[PDB]
From Swiss-Prot:
It comes from Rattus norvegicus (Rat). It catalyses: a catechol + S-adenosyl-L-methionine = a guaiacol + S-adenosyl-L-homocysteine + H(+); 2-hydroxyestrone + S-adenosyl-L-methionine = 2-hydroxy-3-methoxy-estrone + S-adenosyl-L-homocysteine + H(+); 4-hydroxyestrone + S-adenosyl-L-methionine = 4-methoxyestrone + S-adenosyl-L-homocysteine + H(+); 2-hydroxyestrone + S-adenosyl-L-methionine = 2-methoxyestrone + S-adenosyl-L-homocysteine + H(+). Binds 1 Mg(2+) ion per subunit. This is Catechol O-methyltransferase. The lineage of its organism: Eukaryota, Metazoa, Chordata, Craniata, Vertebrata. Keywords: Catecholamine metabolism, Cell membrane, Cytoplasm, Lipid metabolism, Magnesium, Membrane, Metal-binding, Methyltransferase, Neurotransmitter degradation, Phosphoprotein, S-adenosyl-L-methionine, Signal-anchor, Transferase, Transmembrane, Transmembrane helix. Belongs to the class I-like SAM-binding methyltransferase superfamily. Cation-dependent O-methyltransferase family. The gene is Comt. It comes from the Eukaryota. GO terms for molecular function: catechol O-methyltransferase activity; magnesium ion binding.
Length: 213
């Protein structure tokens, strides 16, 4: 089997069904003690939790689901009626994410989009009944952060106050995205310095709040 299947099996065998917090702790436990994996982790996840609780977004878009750790982390804090849409181009990973969300009891809150973000972003308004996004979590391939941010703006998916939260802006790093949002008056930026998941390597999240054209 794969590492992603072993993570899901550990959750199914150790986490409590319908308990998102228990599912998160099981994923973090397995990857801390057995196999490292690119989940956002508990250190940066706690910063994510605080950002989510401050802005209380009604519609969240996630770029990169992997095994569903970040989707479980964000969906467990959403108000009733709020929605999370997550895009995952790997079908093997998205099948794991769906089973992870089902186990945590959050399937009614999260919708998985199978495909590449650059192909799915232009179809959000028509196919998934989206006006503008309240929050965007960027966590896919690092070279897509900036072009997808420009694509989200072109398709009219950003409004004044839309919160962009970017992972891995230090390690592995997103230099072009970081330089663009920090240099553009369209984005007010705040850096939250933390640590790479399950490690003591320095990383951080960048919050970029859209201010308009
Ligand atoms: C593990 C590691 C170590 Cl020990 C060192 C020293 N360095 O330099 C790097 Cl770069 C890595 C590293 N490899 O992959 C990732 C990573 C993390 C994500 O959170 C993420 O989302 C994605 N991703 O591909 O989406 C990738 N990090
Ligand atoms: N262009 C793209 N469109 C959609 N998904 C992409 C993508 N490029 C990479 N990805 C996916 O994004 C994932 C990044 S790992 C992200 C982990 C997750 N956000 C968490 O914290 O738990 C990978 O699984 C990869 O398959
Ligand atoms: Mg990441």
């Amino acid at each position: 089997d794969t590492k992603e299947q072993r993570i899901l099996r550990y959750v199914q065998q150790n986490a409590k069904p319908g308990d998102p917090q228990s599912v998160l702790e099981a994923i973090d436990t397995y990857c801390t003690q057995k196999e490292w994996a690119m989940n956002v982790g508990d250190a940066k996840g706690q910063i994510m939790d605080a950002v989510i609780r401050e802005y209380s977004p009604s519609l969240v878009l996630e770029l990169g689901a992997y095994c569903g750790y970040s989707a479980v982390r964000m969906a467990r804090l959403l108000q009733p009626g709020a929605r999370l849409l997550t895009m995952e181009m790997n079908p093997d990973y998205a099948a794991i994410t769906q089973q992870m969300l089902n186990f945590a009891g959050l399937q009614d809150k999260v919708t998985i989009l199978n495909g590449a973000s650059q192909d799915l972003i232009p179809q959000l308004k028509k196919k998934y009944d989206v006006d503008t996004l309240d929050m965007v979590f960027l966590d896919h391939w690092k070279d897509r952060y900036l072009p997808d941010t420009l694509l989200l703006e072109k398709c009219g998916l950003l409004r004044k106050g839309t919160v962009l939260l970017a992972d891995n802006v230090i390690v592995p790093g997103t230099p072009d995205f970081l330089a663009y949002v920090r240099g553009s008056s369209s984005f007010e930026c705040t850096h939250y310095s933390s640590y790479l998941e399950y490690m003591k390597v320095v990383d951080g999240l960048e919050k970029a709040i859209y201010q308009g054209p």
